[PDB]
Design an enzyme around this catalytic site. Sequence first.
Site, short mmCIF file in Angstrom:
data_model
loop_
_atom_site.label_atom_id
_atom_site.label_comp_id
_atom_site.label_asym_id
_atom_site.label_seq_id
_atom_site.Cartn_x
_atom_site.Cartn_y
_atom_site.Cartn_z
N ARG A 109 41.94 31.85 41.01
CA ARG A 109 41.50 33.21 41.28
C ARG A 109 40.18 33.22 42.05
NH1 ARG A 109 39.23 38.57 38.80
NH2 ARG A 109 37.58 37.34 37.79
N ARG A 126 27.64 49.51 41.40
CA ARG A 126 26.63 48.49 41.08
C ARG A 126 25.20 49.02 41.16
NH1 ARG A 126 30.13 43.83 40.48
NH2 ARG A 126 28.67 43.59 38.74
N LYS A 157 45.92 45.83 38.49
CA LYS A 157 45.03 45.67 37.35
C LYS A 157 44.78 47.01 36.67
CE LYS A 157 41.31 43.59 38.46
NZ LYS A 157 40.15 42.67 38.56
N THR A 207 40.33 38.31 30.71
CA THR A 207 38.91 38.63 30.43
C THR A 207 38.47 38.42 28.99
OG1 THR A 207 38.83 40.19 32.30
CG2 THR A 207 37.02 40.30 30.69
O1 OXL Z 1 39.05 43.00 36.36
C1 OXL Z 1 38.80 42.34 35.33
O2 OXL Z 1 39.18 41.16 35.14
C2 OXL Z 1 37.96 43.03 34.24
O3 OXL Z 1 37.59 44.21 34.45
O4 OXL Z 1 37.68 42.40 33.20
K K Z 2 37.17 41.92 41.12
MG MG Z 3 37.12 44.69 36.54
#
Ligand code: OXL
Ligand code: K
Ligand code: MG
Lengths: 512, 515, 514
Positions: B61, B108, B254, B312
């Site tokens: 990744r 950010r 995602k 994550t």
């Molecule tokens: O996009 C990701 O991997 C997150 O937000 O943890």
């Molecule tokens: K990202």
């Molecule tokens: Mg993220």
Amino acid sequence: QTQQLHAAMADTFLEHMCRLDIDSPPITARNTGIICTIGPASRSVETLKEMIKSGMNVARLNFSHGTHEYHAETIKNVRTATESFASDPILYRPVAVALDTKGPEIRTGLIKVELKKGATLKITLDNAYMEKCDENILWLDYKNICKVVEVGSKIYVDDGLISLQVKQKGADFLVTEVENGGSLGSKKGVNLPGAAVDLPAVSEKDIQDLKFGVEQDVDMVFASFIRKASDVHEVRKVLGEKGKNIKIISKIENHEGVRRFDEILEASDGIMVARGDLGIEIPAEKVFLAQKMMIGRCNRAGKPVICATQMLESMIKKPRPTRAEGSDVANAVLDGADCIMLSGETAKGDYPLEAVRMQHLIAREAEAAIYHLQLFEELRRLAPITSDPTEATAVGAVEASFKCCSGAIIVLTKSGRSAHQVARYRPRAPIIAVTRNPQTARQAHLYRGIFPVLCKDPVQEAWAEDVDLRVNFAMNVGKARGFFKKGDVVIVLTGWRPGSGFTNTMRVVPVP
Amino acid sequence: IQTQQLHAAMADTFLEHMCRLDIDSPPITARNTGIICTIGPASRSVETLKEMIKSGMNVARLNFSHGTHEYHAETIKNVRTATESFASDPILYRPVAVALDTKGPEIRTGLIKGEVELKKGATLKITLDNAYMEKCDENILWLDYKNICKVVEVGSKIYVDDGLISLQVKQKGADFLVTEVENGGSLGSKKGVNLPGAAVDLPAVSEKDIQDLKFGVEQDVDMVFASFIRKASDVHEVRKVLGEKGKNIKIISKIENHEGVRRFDEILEASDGIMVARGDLGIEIPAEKVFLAQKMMIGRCNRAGKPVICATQMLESMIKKPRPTRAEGSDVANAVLDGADCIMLSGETAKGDYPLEAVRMQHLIAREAEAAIYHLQLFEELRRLAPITSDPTEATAVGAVEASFKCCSGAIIVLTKSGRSAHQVARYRPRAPIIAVTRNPQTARQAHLYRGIFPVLCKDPVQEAWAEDVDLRVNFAMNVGKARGFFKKGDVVIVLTGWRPGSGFTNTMRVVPVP
Amino acid sequence: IQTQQLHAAMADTFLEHMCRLDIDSPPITARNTGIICTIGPASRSVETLKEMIKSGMNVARLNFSHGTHEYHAETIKNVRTATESFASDPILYRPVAVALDTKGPEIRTGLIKEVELKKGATLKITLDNAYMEKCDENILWLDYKNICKVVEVGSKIYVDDGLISLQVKQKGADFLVTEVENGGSLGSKKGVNLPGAAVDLPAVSEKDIQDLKFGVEQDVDMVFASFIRKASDVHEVRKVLGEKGKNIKIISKIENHEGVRRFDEILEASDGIMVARGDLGIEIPAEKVFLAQKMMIGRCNRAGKPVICATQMLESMIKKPRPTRAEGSDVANAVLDGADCIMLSGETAKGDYPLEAVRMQHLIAREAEAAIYHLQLFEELRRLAPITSDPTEATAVGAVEASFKCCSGAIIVLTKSGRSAHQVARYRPRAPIIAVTRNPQTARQAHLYRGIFPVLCKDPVQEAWAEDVDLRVNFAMNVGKARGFFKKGDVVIVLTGWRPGSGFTNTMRVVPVP
Ligand SMILES: O=C([O-])C(=O)[O-]
Ligand SMILES: [K+]
Ligand SMILES: [Mg+2]
Ligand SMILES: O=P(O)(O)OC[C@H]1O[C@](O)(COP(=O)(O)O)[C@@H](O)[C@@H]1O
Ligand SMILES: O=P(O)(O)OC[C@H]1O[C@](O)(COP(=O)(O)O)[C@@H](O)[C@@H]1O
Ligand SMILES: O=P(O)(O)OC[C@H]1O[C@](O)(COP(=O)(O)O)[C@@H](O)[C@@H]1O
Ligand SMILES: O=C([O-])C(=O)[O-]
Ligand SMILES: O=C([O-])C(=O)[O-]
Ligand SMILES: [K+]
Ligand SMILES: [Mg+2]
Ligand SMILES: [Mg+2]
């Protein structure tokens, strides 16, 4: 909704029952084998052809009556009727021949008669009275009867309709009291429940009949009054190596046979739930228990099972069966019986054809009502983890067939077993077993779902093309029988090389 | 005695299955769940990048919310150098996919004025004034989101740096916001900001996002992890940008926010797969609700046959420690037991002190977890919910998986071009590993998205007689199996082929002993 | 639409159940899983100790591998002060148990001369008491004076939560030469673990006997017995607790390979089990823990005995106000596995966020309890329940069954010893079990069981036993209304007996709320 599709999609057994619909037509294929007893009413080549038309799959010869040449003629008539369709391999149907033994049965003599509740009856072994029976004296086959019977024992005569209680015992005679009357005829069946009879399972006459069947090139033996594994092994020995391929179906007819069932089933090719004698030998209320127990264990063990006797009695004299008879057949199929059997109905009945047509009709309806989700599922869980290619291919084939809603599973087989292994997992779709062996073609009728198809074409040369041809033969049979159409999808099972026990290939193929 | 929880899988009930789980029952050497590693400073070197493949990394990744185009272009080069360093032996070689994870619509902070500490109670002003973008302190703070004052409210909560800092807005201005610090902690440079319950108007695919996607197409990537997908139209936008030149590149959406969870069926439907991005999600919706979202999404993806990645903080601890916390070990196991196709490491392998040990741990847990899977109930429920179809490939796949449970097989060997023949076997979740033999290098790398698929790349020239060409690829698989310890000589195996060349003709299942 | 995952629990399959799980479906205000907090420097003050009860602490753990007898005697006093500070209102009051967790047969290092160790550099291990406070990168002292008899050339030695690992190169009489396999910094008095090496330290030591006898005197509720390895070890704890503390519950902690293997032997002799993941995660491979955990929780569920999931559930929160995604996932699964209680250690003993840690456990457990597939669970628990002719058991099963049918808000149970309530709990109803007792100890002990809400009755014994029963039933009724478990019109299950005394529960009544 075709063949209870909406019924089979239910979550629970109860929801499944509730969704059963009378207006949902079944598929044209009927999976349960029909076995007919042949006698005076069905012996003629002419009517014998019409029984095949109506759906008879196996012919039973009852060897407790008739001479060797009486039967030799019956077999000839059967094979004449069967081969009368052989001029077209596509529409032709193999028909098995079955020998049902006499076995260790007890009979009365000839009447000189009405019996009354209370009036006493004497039973003699004196051969001078063997043709002089009346309301005072009665003669028997069992010359060792006085050694196993008791003061107070019940003796049953003629399908357990006459009952007698033994008051006094003699050396060669017995004094009984009639407990319920009815009229007494000639040479009637006698039962002795709770009394251990010492007659051999295979007698001298039995050996003669078995050896005769071997010579007549029969397909299966229904062995009467089997009581232990050793009795099954005796039948094997007599059949010998010349008839080692003849299937042995043990008939459970008594308390001991029920109890040593696992012992018997294990040693036999199949089982028949012989309800007639069984219903006299053990209490009539207990039969359904025995029946359901035996059909289940046979299903678990992949071996064939026949439900037999009095399935449609009424039809011996009537064109329509009683509600209970119609209910009985259906349940026998729902229990999971491979084959259902007619006796008096086709041997001596006034309506042999109508009786067969009725069995086809009910079995077909019953087959649709089968909760195939739960059935196949439970048959997997209880199936052994094996590293045998054939078995793995069979399970996978059946599984695939439920998934693509297929019209058939086509299976190339020599001994029949490739087809047997698909059958034990009970697909919805019909199993078309293509063989060149005429005997395994006829024997295939013992198994639920197997449609045996005999190939008469000469062995092509390239084995690949020889396979393809047999596969197309099945395909044509399917189209002609209305099992599937052109666009339909089908499962095909083959092997990687010739010879028995190499089936390992499953193919999903559209129909030409 | 009792391999890979054979006694556990034979149980009648789920409870009896749990009770029969045995720690002293060793798993099979094959591990089905794909491992995805994020590459950064700690894992970028060809040298350590080789060792990650040794340890079990299946996908690489690249996080595109940091670094320049050429930073990544170099990372990809290093990955392909390490991967092809094993290519001198087709039998032991392992394909390794490359993944582009987008920056997306993220907010950010600026740089800390030349680490500032914040106190519970003390107020903080938020400016959009670009003159402060590198002068952040305990009094002023700068942001990316120049339209923030239009979607935020007096009383709204603003979260900063993985949702560890929280602020409540007291007063609103034109280009400024006055907040009260609700819980302190120290503030660093360029940190992530989250606004739950506030409908942000940043585009799912931005200008920079379009640049990155087009760059990935050129770098010949395998898959795109699209950040902050909120509806089907956002997925369709990614497709359009990837275009016809990159139409084979897989789109993994995602799910990171409340809207993405809600319009999930809409999204999953339009996507090649799903990633449960727990990091942002755990800030966007309540932390106690994450497991619910996770289990819901994995189940629906399993139902739909599409890949799903659990992502994550699976092993956070290991960024600084050689051993993970008990909760982290428990988390990985459950993700696999939930039915996740792939599990993902982020900080653990990008900037950690223990990138290798972190990958080895994921292999180990996933392998144990795969043995504990109640395969009776799983396969069963996946049949009942599978559609009645007249497609040959599907029927052959179900039958193959069924046969594999019956003959206790060591593998299911599947010839495939696009990967899909292998995909269809995978969705029914066999015990045995699926060895997918292809000549297409891209579908070989992409096959790692699916649970149980072992992609095997064939380098031999196209034989002549198509029959023999098939046989050769089948024997290639056979050798790979033997060498990997998946099966021995006498063992039994399932083989799937087609009746003619080209995609979508798989219809043949064969049960075959191993040479 | 849809309260506490009603649409999720109506599914036919486990997979369809997962797919129907909805984040926007709020749980019931009742939370079934017990919370156990370890008390230390960060949570010792009466003032913060009150706030932990507010947040949901049900049991207080005292770790007896640290501190003196009077350190703990003071901790217990502070707990009971905070607890009885709510006693001025029997309706809103919450019983809080006190638990003694033993030191047991553990191995510790001496005091550092912190020191840093390097991968490769050798380390000597001495038993020489002259070095017990002079530890460095060259020498290290230990408690286990019989170590050299059970260790091997090539054995792995783990130090400080299994983060330091060493391999033994040479063996001496009273010394060992090791090679550091992975470094990290070494502190004072750290835990040592020897996997695959059969240690001969007694399960109950001299100090252990002292602590147990002390707990009996301090009138504790339960004992968490560390490093239990066989049934004989459990029986030893019983003997020491004696007849003066025969009512004190024994919870065996499974921390090693042998404890896992002789589990059925242990569970059978114990009042409950704790899956002590900390030590277990060093003693057996870390990848195998979830297996052990799920196995033990299942068997305890099958056996109707309590089970605690313990250690590192929310580590992150020792230093952070928010837990990691894995930690949130871990708690949920422990509840979904069927754990009666969940436990915080460092999080509440020495953490920077003890309250936030407890609040988080409440919150997750409540969400997890809603997600429970109650159809399949209750069903499988019946099939595996024994055919018994015991009135109490039959009444309990029937009560739980009735509660699923009428969607009830609670099952009210009058109990003295707690067992009437225990029997309803093992069948895992949705509805909370309100156990009304006068026995203060069984009220506190009831927290070990999932679903049981213990309620202590302070009213004097009325005269007519019939009315005395009615009063306790109405007491429960008022507690329910005040806690928001049910309203006026709602329907409820009530369990009573035909006569006074333990073990006569046989009456189930379906009754509307006053
Ligand atoms: O996009 C990701 O991997 C997150 O937000 O943890
Ligand atoms: K990202
Ligand atoms: Mg993220
Ligand atoms: O009798 P079985 O055990 O069913 O064997 C069936 C055999 O028939 C075949 O289909 C071919 O039969 P033939 O050898 O007669 O051509 C083989 O592939 C297979 O091994
Ligand atoms: O997964 P896909 O793309 O459907 O591939 C399956 C194909 O593999 C094959 O076995 C071999 O295909 P090729 O000869 O084109 O390489 C075909 O018979 C079948 O159609
Ligand atoms: O769980 P236990 O200890 O058996 O308590 C149940 C008992 O409590 C009661 O409900 C109340 O009796 P008491 O007044 O003695 O407490 C009895 O009817 C029943 O026998
Ligand atoms: O022989 C038979 O058929 C019987 O007894 O049922
Ligand atoms: O002691 C404990 O709780 C452990 O080791 O987990
Ligand atoms: K301890
Ligand atoms: Mg008979
Ligand atoms: Mg411990």
